[PDB]
């Protein structure tokens, strides 16, 4: 009969889908022709599958009920007792090592160490073959050239759950690599191939070393353009000398030419944004390093979730090849790059918003655009950025950004004042090396200030600027015209452009006022992130990040406070209100010339103190140092590293901000900001998920080291930052 | 889901193929031979009477049935 | 979702839902009908209905998979012309993704694989079944899709001209002439091969392409 | 997280408690660290009132049989040399004859130990670990290995005399079967369903009556059949199959004398006409050598992981992996008595000789039993 | 216009190592040319059975270097035409 439904029950999550596949191999399927008798016969095949998966104890039963006119509903019930526990891994014939060292390198285990309980000692035959190959590779690496794996045995116990596995091996003796000979048509590149072949004759033979020798010979031949040379390595052995002479036979083949460069999978990214990242040119002799650098540049650009490279010999043509770059695009058709919803969230009982769009899809002229409109604390800040990473295909980028900013000071650690700022920057950036970028820019800013509650740190700048404001008055006004030579420097080398695994990024930003500017100052910023693959495996990573900053006045004007540094946001230092860290805004006593009785404004003398006054408000600092060390791990879930490439991290942050011009001597009665050793710290867990909207970021990190007035928030959440 | 309950046939994107696609031909000057058309990407003759996508129906045909 | 109602009632109500434009529930109902009753003669008709619903419901990968399944089950069938047209239309529709390209920017040089496969399928349709009612619209789509492919090739040639990989430019424009000779894209491209040939000091070849552009300026 | 649904198939509860006679332990002693969650043939031996026992760590003990007084003790563990100390990883039963004690190992070594002294006489390397109980026959020690290879060692010096290959599948159950000798030939069982006889001289093959009757389509159903010590009387061979068919064979030729449907069987002992047999379903039954007919059968200890059965003091006696010891009537086919002697594990087979019944626990302790 | 910037060392055309240039002789057919120099990456499309071998490099952003080697064949593929040149300068 035909079956309306086939159901499986009792499975302890062990490959339920493959059970349908087993039935398909058995010739039955939902609605397929099978009767009750053949169902019972075929159920044995399910037992066969669970025998193959290691559940030797398993047996299966069938339950079925017909509909009134011979249409069938089927359930399949499973018994899946404990099985496949490797009670031993045994090696016999070994005489060069203690077996415990050998088996410890297996994926399989005999006894899981309590010191670090990782996985479990569960058998799997394919992994047994893999581990046999690892054993052979170990013995050949140690130098036993004649090593042999002989008749490996697998056993299970008269009670079927108990497994143990035996391997017989023969060793001979470890042999010296008495010499290496390379022969064939090398096309004149013998000298460098020899440098690859360079070895001390006293060196012990090593299978891994000869394998890497073949790999690097292939690499060198690829760089010069031999895509598919025949490379052979063959040992010449004498057992009485107990040494191995080594033979390498090479046919360089043809110099392969790249007829076509094909990009596939980019349904929205304009082809130019991939092709201009190429180092290997079309219609030119192939370079394996050139193609690999193209792949690396595509990964580094960050537009593409995956980048895959295939080299295909042109059908029927001897030496021409197509180079195919297959990619999956970031955001999977969600418009305008990653939509930057910026948020202020965490333990803090405060709300802040940022809204923006990013990256690629923008109109009419091939530029890449970024927009941002925000209110943070009681500030209002909006900016528009227009960029073309390739103003001309040679590599020089061009970028111009416009912004407007406003300041209102209803607490949120924002010092009491009213200020407005707007300005622009025009920027150029031209790579100096494949991994270096250098920038020059010109910037213009204007500012107006009012309702200036008197404040020592800012007033240090105002007092030195001239037009010194009158102390104890709540209101003072100031203006500035600004021109700046914006400049920067960058080094960028990263696996992917996101969730990196290897390489480093260094970004240096600095500006100096060109005379005619009112501020007459210079400041320097340094940003650095470094990544390392744990155990040289990129699936497991550790990130080291630091930021540094200084700014001082060239004409003695020090720096305008409104360009001071800050930290506390999740981008810089987790675990604090966005800008609370660092020197605090000490006010003067003042007589509330402009005031509202509804507000307990800081230290208005008619209500507050009649002397210099502390507050939670932060003025940032004219110097900065921030560091972070991070540890990255997986965390399985229905959405995981494989399904969605989610990232989670254990990390420690070190942050500090200090003012170089705090009068440590004169102001002994108040906290001395002049020393950077007032280090803040935080540590904990962080999470990031590349949702179609964009990068979500989640983290809990208690600020376990803290100073006066730092508004802590042990948890913080945000979305975006795109980079 | 939200929509006007129509365009039961067209794609979500631009159906620009209906217009702005004349197959301008290319002519060989005397004394030069142009490269051959090379296979598939030629378009054969067409009836020209069939309707076009703004009116033509893309529902499956009324196949006969039995059971 | 749908219980084991008789196949005829399920099909009638699913056809109604198709006419009501209830694409999601229509897809569920035809999927249930196929699952419970794939053996009966309704399978083919259910397969065609599933094909149409997948295409219109914007489930293009599933539409393509169902088309492949139908073609595998029915190498010969009175509606193969329609199913091949559906394959072409699905791969064509896979390109025009969203609004921002609709009002914002041309979408000719993103990826040809979908367009190229759709063009090959439409070529099969028009060549094998010219008398079919779907031939003419298939021909218009073939013309537009070939123009789009030629524009992609031109958009690669322009890049290589800007970078100056002149051998690449010459090779690409020659390939366009080989495959897409009768298009506006190649007519505009030849004035670029004329520059490319000269940049490499290959005077006579540049002169010959100049001869071609002289006549084809019309 | 996930612990709520671990699956295990249940063993039958303990049988009725009432007993016709009350068994008692005569004495017990710790040979050393126990076998543990570990599976290999290793059981005490007796000859002339001197007990010999050993365990995985390599400890070997010689003891008096009336009482647990030690004769001598030695450890075969390797000298550490300040590197990772290596235990002997002992396995493969204990056998005694004249002046020597023969012990296998889970590694290549097979050790020969003196009876009157702890002195190691000789140790020889063999192809694959000697999981099987070595046997003595006409001045040689015959050994079967996990690797399916059978070796004969010169008893005088331990040198290998010949080698014979018995085929095994990649998944061969426990690669153990102890050969036996009579009528001038040595019977052997191989994991690949190959019950066979060897000349016990120059490694000469006699016959190979392979049991293809398993016909296992799936690999687990094709699990290696024979692992049991075959026995012989009147030139008739008897053998077992873990999954296949019990059979009685000619010893002159390999031809069938009888064949039975019984699989899932790994141990048995013979009366003059009655086979006493243990299923891996832990069914216990008495079968006639002729015709394979059942005198009695009971299965109350189903899935209890029974020991090999032995005949002692007019009763069939068998243990289990739970810690209990049971006496079954020879011909009435019902429990004569039941006892608990251990809490850890009691898997290896008992030995009955010289009027004693001896057993070694899965946890390193021996017991002398009487009833 | 002209500035110091990391122009990515474009290679173009075939490789004309002097040995393979010396390999060619006038008596060859197209197969011998293909074996000696590799497939021509610039086949002449406009009628004439002409093969153009171009070897062009621009290391960095200075000093364009190129060789042009032009070959022509009869309709049978038999060769009788050779032009061999170092190219004029660029940047």
From Swiss-Prot, chain A:
Q: What is this protein called?
A: Outer membrane protein assembly factor BamA
Q: Which residues cross the membrane?
A: 338-346, 349-359, 368-375, 379-388, 397-408, 418-419, 436-448, 477-490, 504-513, 522-532, 542-552, 622-631, 646-658, 681-690, 692-702, 717-721
The record's Pfam families line, in alphabetical order, gives: Omp85 (PF01103), POTRA (PF07244)
HAMAP family the record matches: OM_assembly_BamA (MF_01430)
**According to its UniProt record, which protein family does this protein belong to?**
Belongs to the BamA family.
Q: What is the effect of changing residue 343 to C?
A: Reduced folding of OmpT
Q: What is the effect of changing residue 348 to L?
A: Very minor growth defect. Lethal
Q: What is known of its domains?
A: Contains 5 N-terminal periplasmic polypeptide transport-associated (POTRA) domains which interact with other subunits of the complex, may recruit substrates from the periplasm into the outer membrane and also act as a chaperone. The C-terminal region forms a discontinuous 16-stranded beta-barrel transmembrane region. The central pore is ellipsoid, and probably closed by extracellular loop 6, perhaps with the aid of other loops.
Give any Gene Ontology cellular component. Answer: membrane
- Impact after mutating residue 653 to A: Slow growth on solid and liquid media, less protein accumulates which is more proteinase sensitive
- Explain what the UniProt record notes about the effect of disrupting the gene for this protein: Deletion is lethal. Depletion results in the accumulation of incorrectly assembled outer membrane proteins, including TolC, OmpF, OmpC and OmpA. Decreased expression leads to decreased susceptibility to contact-dependent growth inhibition (CDI), and decreased expression of outer membrane proteins (including in this study LamB) as well as up-regulation of periplasmic protease DegP.
UniProtKB/Swiss-Prot annotation, chain B:
Species for this entry = Escherichia coli (strain K12)
Where, per UniProt, does this protein localize? Cell outer membrane
Q: What does this protein do?
A: Part of the outer membrane protein assembly complex (Bam), which is involved in assembly and insertion of beta-barrel proteins into the outer membrane. Nonessential member of the complex that stabilizes the interaction between the essential proteins BamA and BamD. Efficient substrate folding and insertion into the outer membrane requires all 5 subunits.
This protein's gene is called bamC
UniProt protein name: Outer membrane protein assembly factor BamC
Q: Where is the lipid attached (N-palmitoyl cysteine)?
A: 1
Question: What family name appears in the similarity comment?
Answer: Belongs to the BamC family.
Q: Per the record, what about its domains?
A: Contains two well-defined domains connected by a flexible linker. The C-terminal domain may serve as an important protein-binding surface for interaction with other Bam components or substrates. In addition, contains a long unstructured N-terminal region, which is required to stabilize the BamCD complex. Only the N-terminus of this protein is observed in the Bam complex in X-ray or EM structures, most of the protein must be highly mobile.
Can you locate the S-diacylglycerol cysteine lipid attachment residues?
1
Q: State which stretch of the full-length protein is shown.
A: 25 to 91 of 344
From Swiss-Prot, chain C:
Membrane topology per the entry is:
Lipid-anchor
Phenotype of the disrupted gene, per the record: Depletion decreases the density of outer membrane proteins, but does not significantly affect transport of lipopolysaccharides to the outer membrane.
Which of UniProt's keywords are assigned here? Answer: Cell outer membrane, Lipoprotein, Membrane, Palmitate, Signal
Q: Does the keyword Lipoprotein apply?
A: yes
Q: Where in the cell is it found?
A: Cell outer membrane
Q: Does the keyword DNA repair apply?
A: no
Gene3D superfamilies in the cross-refs? Tetratricopeptide repeat domain
What's a GO biological-process term for it?
Gram-negative-bacterium-type cell outer membrane assembly
* One CC-aspect GO term: cell outer membrane
Fetch the SUPFAM superfamilies from UniProt: TPR-like (SSF48452)
Task: Give the HAMAP family listed for this entry.
Answer: OM_assembly_BamD
**Anything noted about its domains?**
The N-terminal may interact with various proteins as a chaperone to assist in the folding and insertion of proteins into the outer membrane. The C-terminal region may serve as the link between BamA, BamC and BamE.
Summarize the protein's role. Part of the outer membrane protein assembly complex (Bam), which is involved in assembly and insertion of beta-barrel proteins into the outer membrane. Constitutes, with BamA, the core component of the assembly machinery. Probably involved in transient protein interactions. Efficient substrate folding and insertion into the outer membrane requires all 5 subunits.
- Family of this protein: Belongs to the BamD family.
> What is the name listed in the Swiss-Prot or TrEMBL entry for this protein?
Outer membrane protein assembly factor BamD
Q: What is the lineage of its organism?
A: Bacteria, Pseudomonadati, Pseudomonadota, Gammaproteobacteria, Enterobacterales
UniProtKB/Swiss-Prot annotation, chain D:
Say if the entry is tagged with keyword Phosphoprotein: no
Q: Which SMART domains match?
A: PQQ (SM00564)
Where would you find this protein in the cell?
Answer: Cell outer membrane
Q: Name one GO biological process term.
A: protein insertion into membrane
Species of provenance: Escherichia coli (strain K12)
What protein family is recorded? Belongs to the BamB family.
Reading the lineage from the top rank, the first entry is Bacteria
Q: What is its main location?
A: membrane
Name of the coding gene: bamB
Pfam families, A to Z: PQQ_2
State its role.
Part of the outer membrane protein assembly complex (Bam), which is involved in assembly and insertion of beta-barrel proteins into the outer membrane. Nonessential member of the complex, which may orient the flexible periplasmic domain of BamA for interaction with other Bam components, chaperones and nascent outer membrane proteins. Efficient substrate folding and insertion into the outer membrane requires all 5 subunits.
Q: Which GO terms describe its cellular component?
A: Bam protein complex; cell outer membrane; membrane
Annotated protein name in UniProt: Outer membrane protein assembly factor BamB
